Design an enzyme around this catalytic site. Structure first.
Site, PDB file in Angstrom:
ATOM      1  N   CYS A  12     -18.382 -12.500  -1.983  1.00  0.00           N
ATOM      2  CA  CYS A  12     -17.805 -11.353  -2.668  1.00  0.00           C
ATOM      3  C   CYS A  12     -18.893 -10.666  -3.483  1.00  0.00           C
ATOM      4  O   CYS A  12     -19.676 -11.326  -4.164  1.00  0.00           O
ATOM      5  CB  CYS A  12     -16.683 -11.801  -3.607  1.00  0.00           C
ATOM      6  SG  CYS A  12     -16.087 -10.497  -4.723  1.00  0.00           S
ATOM      7  N   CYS A  21      -8.291  -9.423   0.556  1.00  0.00           N
ATOM      8  CA  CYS A  21      -8.795  -8.813  -0.662  1.00  0.00           C
ATOM      9  C   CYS A  21      -8.578  -7.308  -0.583  1.00  0.00           C
ATOM     10  O   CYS A  21      -8.544  -6.624  -1.605  1.00  0.00           O
ATOM     11  CB  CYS A  21     -10.277  -9.137  -0.826  1.00  0.00           C
ATOM     12  SG  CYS A  21     -10.577 -10.925  -0.875  1.00  0.00           S
ATOM     13  N   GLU A  75       2.378   1.226  11.682  1.00  0.00           N
ATOM     14  CA  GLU A  75       1.844   0.228  12.612  1.00  0.00           C
ATOM     15  C   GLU A  75       2.812  -0.164  13.721  1.00  0.00           C
ATOM     16  O   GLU A  75       2.391  -0.429  14.845  1.00  0.00           O
ATOM     17  CB  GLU A  75       1.437  -1.052  11.872  1.00  0.00           C
ATOM     18  CG  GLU A  75       0.105  -0.991  11.159  1.00  0.00           C
ATOM     19  CD  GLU A  75      -0.207  -2.282  10.426  1.00  0.00           C
ATOM     20  OE1 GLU A  75       0.046  -3.366  11.000  1.00  0.00           O
ATOM     21  OE2 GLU A  75      -0.705  -2.215   9.279  1.00  0.00           O
ATOM     22  N   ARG A  92       0.233   1.347  -3.803  1.00  0.00           N
ATOM     23  CA  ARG A  92      -1.167   1.578  -4.126  1.00  0.00           C
ATOM     24  C   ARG A  92      -1.593   3.046  -4.021  1.00  0.00           C
ATOM     25  O   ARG A  92      -2.293   3.548  -4.898  1.00  0.00           O
ATOM     26  CB  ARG A  92      -2.036   0.702  -3.213  1.00  0.00           C
ATOM     27  CG  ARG A  92      -3.538   0.750  -3.467  1.00  0.00           C
ATOM     28  CD  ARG A  92      -3.974   0.086  -4.764  1.00  0.00           C
ATOM     29  NE  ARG A  92      -5.435   0.041  -4.862  1.00  0.00           N
ATOM     30  CZ  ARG A  92      -6.109  -0.413  -5.915  1.00  0.00           C
ATOM     31  NH1 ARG A  92      -5.458  -0.862  -6.970  1.00  0.00           N
ATOM     32  NH2 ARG A  92      -7.434  -0.425  -5.914  1.00  0.00           N
ATOM     33  N   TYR A  93      -1.161   3.733  -2.965  1.00  0.00           N
ATOM     34  CA  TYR A  93      -1.543   5.132  -2.753  1.00  0.00           C
ATOM     35  C   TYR A  93      -0.480   6.228  -2.696  1.00  0.00           C
ATOM     36  O   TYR A  93      -0.808   7.377  -2.406  1.00  0.00           O
ATOM     37  CB  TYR A  93      -2.411   5.210  -1.495  1.00  0.00           C
ATOM     38  CG  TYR A  93      -3.544   4.207  -1.505  1.00  0.00           C
ATOM     39  CD1 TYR A  93      -3.756   3.354  -0.426  1.00  0.00           C
ATOM     40  CD2 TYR A  93      -4.373   4.081  -2.616  1.00  0.00           C
ATOM     41  CE1 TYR A  93      -4.765   2.390  -0.454  1.00  0.00           C
ATOM     42  CE2 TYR A  93      -5.383   3.126  -2.655  1.00  0.00           C
ATOM     43  CZ  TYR A  93      -5.569   2.283  -1.575  1.00  0.00           C
ATOM     44  OH  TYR A  93      -6.541   1.309  -1.635  1.00  0.00           O
ATOM     45  N   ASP A 140       9.268  -1.928   8.923  1.00  0.00           N
ATOM     46  CA  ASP A 140       8.721  -1.008   9.887  1.00  0.00           C
ATOM     47  C   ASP A 140       7.837  -0.062   9.102  1.00  0.00           C
ATOM     48  O   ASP A 140       8.074   0.194   7.921  1.00  0.00           O
ATOM     49  CB  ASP A 140       9.822  -0.219  10.588  1.00  0.00           C
ATOM     50  CG  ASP A 140      10.367  -0.939  11.796  1.00  0.00           C
ATOM     51  OD1 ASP A 140       9.550  -1.442  12.600  1.00  0.00           O
ATOM     52  OD2 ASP A 140      11.606  -0.994  11.951  1.00  0.00           O
ATOM     53  N   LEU A 194     -11.710  -0.419  -2.857  1.00  0.00           N
ATOM     54  CA  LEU A 194     -11.379  -0.560  -1.440  1.00  0.00           C
ATOM     55  C   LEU A 194     -12.559  -0.222  -0.533  1.00  0.00           C
ATOM     56  O   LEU A 194     -12.764  -0.869   0.496  1.00  0.00           O
ATOM     57  CB  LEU A 194     -10.191   0.334  -1.079  1.00  0.00           C
ATOM     58  CG  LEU A 194      -9.792   0.329   0.401  1.00  0.00           C
ATOM     59  CD1 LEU A 194      -9.361  -1.073   0.808  1.00  0.00           C
ATOM     60  CD2 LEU A 194      -8.669   1.326   0.639  1.00  0.00           C
ATOM     61  N   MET A 222       0.850  -1.187   0.000  1.00  0.00           N
ATOM     62  CA  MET A 222       0.000   0.000   0.000  1.00  0.00           C
ATOM     63  C   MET A 222       0.885   1.236   0.000  1.00  0.00           C
ATOM     64  O   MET A 222       0.585   2.237  -0.654  1.00  0.00           O
ATOM     65  CB  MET A 222      -0.904   0.029   1.231  1.00  0.00           C
ATOM     66  CG  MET A 222      -1.743   1.293   1.309  1.00  0.00           C
ATOM     67  SD  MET A 222      -2.869   1.316   2.700  1.00  0.00           S
ATOM     68  CE  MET A 222      -1.752   1.725   4.042  1.00  0.00           C
ATOM     69  N   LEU A 226      -6.472   6.895  -1.390  1.00  0.00           N
ATOM     70  CA  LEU A 226      -7.086   5.784  -0.681  1.00  0.00           C
ATOM     71  C   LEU A 226      -8.608   5.903  -0.617  1.00  0.00           C
ATOM     72  O   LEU A 226      -9.326   4.932  -0.855  1.00  0.00           O
ATOM     73  CB  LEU A 226      -6.495   5.694   0.728  1.00  0.00           C
ATOM     74  CG  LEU A 226      -6.990   4.565   1.628  1.00  0.00           C
ATOM     75  CD1 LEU A 226      -5.905   4.215   2.629  1.00  0.00           C
ATOM     76  CD2 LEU A 226      -8.271   4.979   2.329  1.00  0.00           C
ATOM     77  N   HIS A 275      -2.667  -6.364  11.461  1.00  0.00           N
ATOM     78  CA  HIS A 275      -3.707  -5.374  11.210  1.00  0.00           C
ATOM     79  C   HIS A 275      -5.049  -6.106  11.193  1.00  0.00           C
ATOM     80  O   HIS A 275      -5.195  -7.147  10.560  1.00  0.00           O
ATOM     81  CB  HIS A 275      -3.464  -4.691   9.868  1.00  0.00           C
ATOM     82  CG  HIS A 275      -4.246  -3.426   9.675  1.00  0.00           C
ATOM     83  ND1 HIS A 275      -5.622  -3.399   9.598  1.00  0.00           N
ATOM     84  CD2 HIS A 275      -3.834  -2.146   9.518  1.00  0.00           C
ATOM     85  CE1 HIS A 275      -6.025  -2.155   9.398  1.00  0.00           C
ATOM     86  NE2 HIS A 275      -4.958  -1.376   9.346  1.00  0.00           N
ATOM     87  N   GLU A 335       1.971   3.145  16.258  1.00  0.00           N
ATOM     88  CA  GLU A 335       0.930   2.458  17.016  1.00  0.00           C
ATOM     89  C   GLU A 335       1.438   1.591  18.163  1.00  0.00           C
ATOM     90  O   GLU A 335       1.053   1.795  19.312  1.00  0.00           O
ATOM     91  CB  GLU A 335       0.052   1.617  16.090  1.00  0.00           C
ATOM     92  CG  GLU A 335      -1.286   1.273  16.716  1.00  0.00           C
ATOM     93  CD  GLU A 335      -2.150   0.410  15.827  1.00  0.00           C
ATOM     94  OE1 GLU A 335      -1.890   0.352  14.605  1.00  0.00           O
ATOM     95  OE2 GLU A 335      -3.100  -0.203  16.353  1.00  0.00           O
TER      96      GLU A 335
HETATM   97  C1  LIG Z   1     -10.130  -1.458   7.003  1.00  0.00           C
HETATM   98  C2  LIG Z   1      -9.321  -1.414   5.668  1.00  0.00           C
HETATM   99  C3  LIG Z   1      -9.061  -2.893   5.255  1.00  0.00           C
HETATM  100  C4  LIG Z   1     -10.393  -3.760   5.051  1.00  0.00           C
HETATM  101  C5  LIG Z   1     -11.422  -3.043   4.228  1.00  0.00           C
HETATM  102  O1  LIG Z   1     -11.191  -3.064   2.886  1.00  0.00           O
HETATM  103  O2  LIG Z   1     -12.418  -2.471   4.630  1.00  0.00           O
HETATM  104  C6  LIG Z   1      -7.985  -0.598   5.859  1.00  0.00           C
HETATM  105  C7  LIG Z   1      -7.109  -0.524   4.511  1.00  0.00           C
HETATM  106  C8  LIG Z   1      -6.264   0.803   4.572  1.00  0.00           C
HETATM  107  C9  LIG Z   1      -6.653   1.407   5.963  1.00  0.00           C
HETATM  108  C10 LIG Z   1      -6.501   2.976   6.133  1.00  0.00           C
HETATM  109  C11 LIG Z   1      -5.024   3.464   5.904  1.00  0.00           C
HETATM  110  O3  LIG Z   1      -4.069   2.718   6.744  1.00  0.00           O
HETATM  111  C12 LIG Z   1      -4.927   4.986   6.091  1.00  0.00           C
HETATM  112  C13 LIG Z   1      -5.439   5.508   7.497  1.00  0.00           C
HETATM  113  C14 LIG Z   1      -4.505   5.142   8.680  1.00  0.00           C
HETATM  114  C15 LIG Z   1      -5.075   5.707  10.009  1.00  0.00           C
HETATM  115  O4  LIG Z   1      -4.198   5.337  11.109  1.00  0.00           O
HETATM  116  C16 LIG Z   1      -6.487   5.140  10.301  1.00  0.00           C
HETATM  117  C17 LIG Z   1      -7.437   5.522   9.128  1.00  0.00           C
HETATM  118  C18 LIG Z   1      -6.921   5.054   7.741  1.00  0.00           C
HETATM  119  C19 LIG Z   1      -7.842   5.859   6.739  1.00  0.00           C
HETATM  120  C20 LIG Z   1      -6.993   3.456   7.548  1.00  0.00           C
HETATM  121  C21 LIG Z   1      -8.468   2.923   7.789  1.00  0.00           C
HETATM  122  C22 LIG Z   1      -8.553   1.394   7.614  1.00  0.00           C
HETATM  123  O5  LIG Z   1      -7.650   0.733   8.583  1.00  0.00           O
HETATM  124  C23 LIG Z   1      -8.096   0.899   6.186  1.00  0.00           C
HETATM  125  C24 LIG Z   1      -9.081   1.620   5.176  1.00  0.00           C
HETATM  126  S1  FES Z   2     -13.926  -9.501  -1.772  1.00  0.00           S
HETATM  127 FE1  FES Z   2     -12.675 -11.338  -1.723  1.00  0.00          FE
HETATM  128  S2  FES Z   2     -12.651 -12.052  -3.810  1.00  0.00           S
HETATM  129 FE2  FES Z   2     -13.900 -10.215  -3.866  1.00  0.00          FE
END
Ligand SMILES: C[C@H](CCC(=O)O)[C@H]1CC[C@H]2[C@@H]3[C@H](O)C[C@@H]4C[C@H](O)CC[C@]4(C)[C@H]3C[C@H](O)[C@]12C
Ligand code: FES
Ligand SMILES: C[C@H](CCC(=O)O)[C@H]1CC[C@H]2[C@@H]3[C@H](O)C[C@@H]4C[C@H](O)CC[C@]4(C)[C@H]3C[C@H](O)[C@]12C
Ligand SMILES: C[C@H](CCC(=O)O)[C@H]1CC[C@H]2[C@@H]3[C@H](O)C[C@@H]4C[C@H](O)CC[C@]4(C)[C@H]3C[C@H](O)[C@]12C
Ligand SMILES: C[C@H](CCC(=O)O)[C@H]1CC[C@H]2[C@@H]3[C@H](O)C[C@@H]4C[C@H](O)CC[C@]4(C)[C@H]3C[C@H](O)[C@]12C
Ligand SMILES: C[C@H](CCC(=O)O)[C@H]1CC[C@H]2[C@@H]3[C@H](O)C[C@@H]4C[C@H](O)CC[C@]4(C)[C@H]3C[C@H](O)[C@]12C
Ligand SMILES: C[C@H](CCC(=O)O)[C@H]1CC[C@H]2[C@@H]3[C@H](O)C[C@@H]4C[C@H](O)CC[C@]4(C)[C@H]3C[C@H](O)[C@]12C
Ligand code: FES
Ligand SMILES: [Cl-]
Ligand SMILES: [Cl-]
Lengths: 359, 359
Positions: free
Chosen positions: A342, A132, A279, A100-101, A276, A34, A12, A28, A199, A283
């Site tokens: 899905c 996914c 996270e 990704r971002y 690193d 996503l 990412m 993002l 995570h 965190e």
């Molecule tokens: C929950 C999701 C993964 C599963 C899903 O697709 O819903 C994960 C993917 C990337 C993550 C995001 C990114 O790490 C960017 C941000 C980091 C911040 O510490 C929290 C919000 C924050 C905006 C995150 C929210 C959430 O944990 C995300 C959106």
């Molecule tokens: S959400 Fe897992 S294959 Fe589409």
């Protein structure tokens, strides 16, 4: 010698500097694969702007930015050096970073790979366990790139979409765990509790069939097997955000629970990432292990070193690519099965993109 | 010759006949460790009577009762025969069945074991993956028994509290999966999706640190590793009841989701129990078959045979006990760590009961 085989390292990514935070969040929140938000094109920029200040502060607390690119580059360099010797038939090899971002973006990487006129391209996710929302998201970007450019790939694609139990990855984790255990007072080493931390995922995602939890669990088992169950452990999850239900136990609440129950010697082991990043550096090290740990009266709480520049990890990457090449596999058997529930049409298209590749 | 070593096979158990259903439920609802209910002594009997008709109907649909005792006895007899040969020094060996909510009750078995004047007693849970709500509950029963009678054990105790990746257990699952795959039309074998299914847990339990999900995930990984990832798979969960959140995906919703998405060739694999019981004979075989059927018609959905009387499984049990005896272990390292958010005082007492046993 012009590059012949390209290894696209997918992750990412994280903002390199505080000034990169806003666009990181904007990209993002604009990823319709996503997440889906009402009037997303209007809310994405807004949410990104509102979160920027707090996120910039988190990165300021760890030095001013994410170290992901530096570690990815070091690992990529080491991997390529080994590959040129391991697989002369596919050399020279070149690694490309596809975040990704953040820059370099997946799309920019593919553009460069095509320009370099590579014969083969390998989408190598840097997440050992498949979600996914992580690896899937990066693979979708590859599929979508070609559909947006209205052109077919000029390279033969394949993917290493997961590798939760690769023996060298397991060895690296075990090694780092043992070296951190050596840092605890000898008298407390046997009393140390190992908390593997990864995570978390929202339950809505877990409940649709995401393979992530089961694979992370597999990594934990292999690591403990190699360590001969020397210490007790639990797999817990971090990074939950928002009021919705996520997969627990939560890492922070588990640390507090252990301390309140007399287990004050804890070893945290990030088990779902290889470098690193926010996270671990923020965190775990600052948000928790500095505010929580102290307030709970813990004796010793340490965190295993991330794999980062470990030469053995570079060897793990090279062996994964080498075996992948020799097997002629296009993707894992697991990728051929989408989540039972899905509801994202792109998943099937992405899967087909790889399973249908010309050999 | 008088028995020297007793192997107490622990399981929740199931009603042997329809007439045993009421008391089965009564004992379960009276278990304050398993659940807390207002005016429990009054509601337990009521809820039991309230559910008896429905549960009796479920058992009537599978022949009139649970086959757990028959299979446990068969496995037990086979295990003992091998043990007398494997470990002459601890022979004669004798198995005892200790069901949590039906006869023979855990308490009744302990009473008989002590009367037999055994020198060694092994609490051998029949659940390969540890949950505080299954194995934990059975171990608590042993501790509370001696706390109830008010006297120390006359036998030397130890426990085999988990064995999620025992090599022979994995081989048995793999063998049964391969044998079932051979029953699918040859032209659809490769298309077969494997759905590993295990009893779910409420999220409140998962979130406190129950080790079950991670261990079940480990079993699945080992089985697929032995099968060389021949087919795609997912680990899903069954048996949720009530309106509260439980760990998903749900097995039934996953089967329906798969069928609706074109995957109509499925192999169900109960991965957290070793014998047929209500979960396999009724829930998977009958309930799901009737709940689905219509519209989204499945092409072929089969269930791998439960381990039951497989002689290799008996060998697995004996190997586990033999290895346990040779290692002088009192319990797994994992049992020495209670859930980070455990709030039940008995868990620590039960742990200490086993870790403190005289050798
Ligand atoms: C929950 C999701 C993964 C599963 C899903 O697709 O819903 C994960 C993917 C990337 C993550 C995001 C990114 O790490 C960017 C941000 C980091 C911040 O510490 C929290 C919000 C924050 C905006 C995150 C929210 C959430 O944990 C995300 C959106
Ligand atoms: S959400 Fe897992 S294959 Fe589409
Ligand atoms: C409705 C949608 C949830 C999508 C869904 O899973 O169904 C949620 C996710 C992000 C939410 C937004 C973000 O939390 C940002 C804003 C927070 C404010 O307190 C309300 C408006 C606000 C602009 C929210 C509106 C709405 O609750 C959103 C857009
Ligand atoms: C925390 C952040 C809002 C920033 C803020 O207003 O403070 C919001 C905006 C978009 C939200 C995400 C999106 O609504 C997409 C997901 C919806 C799921 O129900 C929970 C996780 C999920 C991944 C959400 C996590 C979190 O609630 C987010 C990341
Ligand atoms: C309050 C308690 C929840 C305790 C807990 O968290 O375990 C719940 C669990 C079982 C419930 C009971 C059972 O569902 C049986 C009855 C169902 C009726 O619709 C209401 C009364 C009734 C007698 C319920 C009262 C109350 O909602 C109970 C007793
Ligand atoms: C959810 C719980 C395991 C986790 C825990 O301790 O909460 C399990 C253990 C025994 C289970 C119960 C027993 O299998 C007996 C009953 C079986 C019926 O098919 C559903 C209700 C029924 C009354 C079950 C409810 C629930 O699935 C229980 C109570
Ligand atoms: C289904 C059964 C009876 C409901 C009724 O007949 O009205 C009820 C009575 C006791 C309930 C259980 C107890 O309240 C204990 C647990 C409470 C958790 O929040 C859910 C699972 C949990 C394990 C419950 C599952 C289910 O709702 C039970 C087993
Ligand atoms: S609930 Fe798990 S140890 Fe008590
Ligand atoms: Cl980062
Ligand atoms: Cl049963």
């Amino acid at each position: 010698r012009k590059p012949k085989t390209g290894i696209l390292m997918l992750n990412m990514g994280g903002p390199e500097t505080l000034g990169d935070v806003h666009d990181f969040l904007l990209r993002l929140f604009l990823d319709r694969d996503l997440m889906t938000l009402p009037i997303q094109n209007k809310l994405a920029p807004f949410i990104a702007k509102r979160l920027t200040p707090k996120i910039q502060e988190q990165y300021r607390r760890i030095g001013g930015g994410s170290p992901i690119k530096i570690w990815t580059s070091k690992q990529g360099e080491g991997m390529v050096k080994l590959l040129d010797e391991l697989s002369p038939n596919t050399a020279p090899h070149k690694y490309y970073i596809g975040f990704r971002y953040v820059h370099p973006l997946t799309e920019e990487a593919i553009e460069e790979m095509e320009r370099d006129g590579l014969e083969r391209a390998i989408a190598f996710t840097q997440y050992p366990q498949y979600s996914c929302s992580t690896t899937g998201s990066s693979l979708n970007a590859i599929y979508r790139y070609y559909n947006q450019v209205g052109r077919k790939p000029t390279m033969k694609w394949s993917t290493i979409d997961r590798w939760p139990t690769h023996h060298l990855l397991i060895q690296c984790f075990a090694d780092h765990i043992l070296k951190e255990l050596d840092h605890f007072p000898l008298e407390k080493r046997s009393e140390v509790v190992i908390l593997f931390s990864a995570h978390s995922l929202p339950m809505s995602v877990v409940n649709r069939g995401d393979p992530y939890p089961q694979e992370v669990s597999a990594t934990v088992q292999k690591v403990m097997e190699r360590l001969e169950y020397c210490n007790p452990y639990r797999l817990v999850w971090q990074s939950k955000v928002g009021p919705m239900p996520w997969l627990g136990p939560q890492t922070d609440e588990s640390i507090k629970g252990l301390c309140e129950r007399g287990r004050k010697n804890i070893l945290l082991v990030p088990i779902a990432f290889t470098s690193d990043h926010i996270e671990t550096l923020y965190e775990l090290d600052i948000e928790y292990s500095q505010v929580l740990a102290k307030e709970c009266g813990v004796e010793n709480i340490r965190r295993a070193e991330s794999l980062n520049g470990n030469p053995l990890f570079s060897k793990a990457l090279a062996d994964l690519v080498h075996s992948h090449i020799q097997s002629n596999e296009l993707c894992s058997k697991q990728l051929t099965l989408s989540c039972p529930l899905c509801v994202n049409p792109v998943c099937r298209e992405t899967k087909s993109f790889f399973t249908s590749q010309q050999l």
